[PDB]
Amino acid sequence: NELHPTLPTNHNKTKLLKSLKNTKYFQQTTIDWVEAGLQLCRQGHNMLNLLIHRKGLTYLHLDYNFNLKPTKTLTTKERKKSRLGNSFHLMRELLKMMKLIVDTHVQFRLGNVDAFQLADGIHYILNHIGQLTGIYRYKYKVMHQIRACKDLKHIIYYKFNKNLGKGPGCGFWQPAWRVWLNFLRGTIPLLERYIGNLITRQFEDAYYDLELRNSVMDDILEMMPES
């Protein structure tokens, strides 16, 4: 990273624009974060369904913890119909991940939980996506991120457990979280583009010689537009 830095310049952000000009974005409802997260999850669930509908309506159906699976009628034609894109899958995975973190928060907020457990849960989520859900099945540059997270976790655990304490109980989710955020940032724009494409579903070496031949011919034609 150090070796290859990156430069930006002039820009106008999206969120601010949305807040300002675009209806129907009314704004700044001071939500307890958990509620907001839940809402987002719900919306995510809705969106996938909508997308599916827009395509040929499938046999498969999502869980509210997003784990996509087929209802019934497992056939070749069906499979063909319902392969769709890896981008979509990635998005779904992301949503699931979000739910998992949000769900831990929710759990913490209600009973049958602890705060320590919350942190630990978060850590588990982040530092095991590889366990908890496959994005690594859909975009393998997630795998690098996952590896990094794992490494971080490893570093922490020796750092943490110099004393007699040894087991599942450990919070400190920060660097893993950061990594995940970075990954998301890396991935968002492409995902957004994909989504746009999906919605706008009605509206939009050695060939060189051939090209030359064509182009020249065209030029010639232009030159002589006679009888």
Binding site: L212, S215, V216, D219, I220, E222, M223, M224, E226, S227
Partner: protein, 46 residues
């Protein structure tokens, strides 16, 4: 990309007549190709 021929095209436009265009000689396969096609094919008529 296609710049080196533009001048040539322009020149062509300037020069030619309609009559000249009309009387462009329909071109003969100077590398007697169809004969060769005939001959190989006949040799290797399967």
């Amino acid at each position: 990309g296609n710049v080196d021929l533009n001048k040539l095209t322009e020149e062509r436009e300037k020069l030619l007549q309609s009559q000249i265009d009309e009387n462009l000689a329909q071109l003969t396969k100077n590398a007697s190709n169809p004969i060769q096609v005939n001959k190989p094919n006949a040799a290797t008529d399967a």
